[PDB]
Design an enzyme around this catalytic site. Structure first.
Site, short mmCIF file in Angstrom:
data_model
loop_
_atom_site.label_atom_id
_atom_site.label_comp_id
_atom_site.label_asym_id
_atom_site.label_seq_id
_atom_site.Cartn_x
_atom_site.Cartn_y
_atom_site.Cartn_z
N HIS A 1 -12.98 40.28 130.03
CA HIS A 1 -14.39 40.14 130.38
C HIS A 1 -14.76 40.92 131.68
O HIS A 1 -15.88 41.59 131.54
CB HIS A 1 -14.93 38.62 130.80
CG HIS A 1 -15.09 37.94 129.46
ND1 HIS A 1 -14.29 37.43 128.37
CD2 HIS A 1 -16.44 37.62 128.96
CE1 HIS A 1 -14.87 37.07 127.54
NE2 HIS A 1 -16.03 37.01 127.65
N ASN B 1 -24.71 30.20 128.29
CA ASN B 1 -24.54 30.43 126.88
C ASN B 1 -24.67 29.05 125.98
O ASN B 1 -24.55 29.20 125.08
CB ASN B 1 -23.52 31.13 126.31
CG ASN B 1 -23.52 32.41 127.06
OD1 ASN B 1 -24.34 33.10 127.76
ND2 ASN B 1 -22.08 32.91 127.08
N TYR C 1 -29.15 27.64 141.73
CA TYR C 1 -29.43 27.68 143.28
C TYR C 1 -30.54 28.67 143.40
O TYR C 1 -30.60 29.96 143.01
CB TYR C 1 -28.24 27.84 143.89
CG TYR C 1 -27.22 26.87 143.56
CD1 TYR C 1 -27.48 25.49 143.89
CD2 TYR C 1 -25.74 27.02 143.54
CE1 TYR C 1 -26.55 24.30 143.61
CE2 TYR C 1 -24.86 26.07 143.51
CZ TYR C 1 -25.13 24.48 143.31
OH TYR C 1 -24.37 23.60 143.37
N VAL D 1 -18.66 55.36 127.88
CA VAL D 1 -19.98 54.93 127.81
C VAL D 1 -20.67 55.29 129.09
O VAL D 1 -20.40 56.12 129.85
CB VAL D 1 -20.11 53.26 127.42
CG1 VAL D 1 -20.05 53.17 126.14
CG2 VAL D 1 -19.45 52.48 128.48
N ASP E 1 -14.90 38.18 138.69
CA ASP E 1 -14.63 37.78 137.17
C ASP E 1 -13.14 37.54 136.92
O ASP E 1 -12.19 37.18 137.90
CB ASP E 1 -15.38 38.83 136.32
CG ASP E 1 -15.84 38.68 134.98
OD1 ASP E 1 -17.00 38.69 134.56
OD2 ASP E 1 -15.10 38.00 134.09
N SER F 1 -23.48 36.83 130.35
CA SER F 1 -22.33 37.45 131.14
C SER F 1 -22.62 38.92 131.03
O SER F 1 -22.34 39.70 131.85
CB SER F 1 -21.27 37.23 130.41
OG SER F 1 -20.54 35.69 130.82
CA LIG Z 1 -18.71 57.82 130.46
CA LIG Z 2 -32.13 30.72 140.58
#
Ligand SMILES: [Ca+2]
Ligand SMILES: [Ca+2]
Length: 269
Positions: A62, A153, A165, A79, A32, A215
């Site tokens: 991202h 998206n 693929y 989190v 990314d 994503s």
């Molecule tokens: Ca944590």
């Molecule tokens: Ca596939």
């Protein structure tokens, strides 16, 4: 205090953590925009294939967000990832602008296969096919890497490359109702779906942010793959991929959802 994003509990990651499965010993490469240092992440290493950004640090947000869905540390802050003990690698293939050259993406996959990565998370995609990209997907796959990719998206009834693929595991996005998110590409080649709307995760500047997209869905499956790998250390990329699909919860049409919603509880039983 640590909070558990809705997507994490939706895929039943905590059920797996309760059996001792946290992704320990599984190497996961995030291809990314990079991964920023963060108190709720443990970045083991990585490489940058973006000329002009030699560092693996994220100037976009991202990659850090995707990284946190997979492996935000299980502690008293932030989190919690699907596989909070997975060994995370920052593979920078996209620049700060969030776009990158195909060659950088193919270099990142080669790097993943060259470095014994078990899972490669590709939350990126193009509507056009690429010979170069395809060959890199196939090469990483034959090196034992499970390539997990976003369906896209556009909301179109056909999915993006490389998710299209055969050797890429294509991930679409669901909302809180277990419906396909309006933007989630579907159709031929779609393998499975996961939460992709209002996904809270780690974000550069030591904070947390909520994003939407295919994503966001992809890392839930990359994370689920590390849990299965930990439980079945002898399984190949293919065995993991079929198991995830075989244990997914059906949500209705396979054209819209592929196998259905990933379920880490069912997959680690
Ligand atoms: Ca944590
Ligand atoms: Ca596939």
């Amino acid at each position: 205090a640590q909070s558990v994003p809705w997507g994490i509990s939706r895929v039943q990651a905590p059920a797996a953590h309760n059996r001792g499965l946290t992704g320990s010993g599984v190497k996961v490469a995030v291809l990314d925009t990079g991964i920023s240092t963060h108190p709720d992440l443990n970045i083991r290493g990585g490489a940058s294939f973006v000329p002009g950004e030699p560092s693996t640090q994220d100037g976009n947000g991202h990659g850090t967000h995707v990284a946190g869905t997979i492996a935000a540390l299980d502690n008293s802050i932030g989190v919690l990832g699907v596989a909070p003990s997975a060994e995370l690698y920052a593979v920078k293939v996209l620049g700060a602008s969030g776009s990158g050259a195909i060659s950088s993406i193919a270099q990142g996959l080669e790097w993943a296969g060259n470095n014994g990565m078990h899972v490669a998370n590709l939350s990126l995609g193009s509507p056009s096919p690429s010979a170069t990209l395809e060959q890199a997907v196939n090469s990483a796959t034959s090196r034992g890497v499970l390539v997990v990719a976003a369906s896209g998206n556009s909301g179109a009834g056909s999915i993006s490359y490389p998710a299209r693929y055969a050797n890429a595991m294509a991930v679409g996005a669901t909302d809180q109702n277990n419906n396909r998110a309006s933007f989630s590409q579907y159709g031929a080649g779609l393998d499975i779906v996961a939460p992709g709307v209002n996904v809270q995760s780690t974000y550069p500047g030591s904070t947390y942010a909520s994003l939407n997209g295919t994503s966001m869905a992809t890392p839930h499956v990359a994370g689920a793959a590390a849990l299965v790998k930990q439980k079945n250390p002898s399984w190949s990329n293919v065995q993991i991929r079929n198991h995830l699909k075989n244990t997914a919860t059906s949500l209705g049409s396979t054209n819209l959802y592929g196998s259905g919603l990933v379920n880490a509880e069912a997959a680690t039983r």
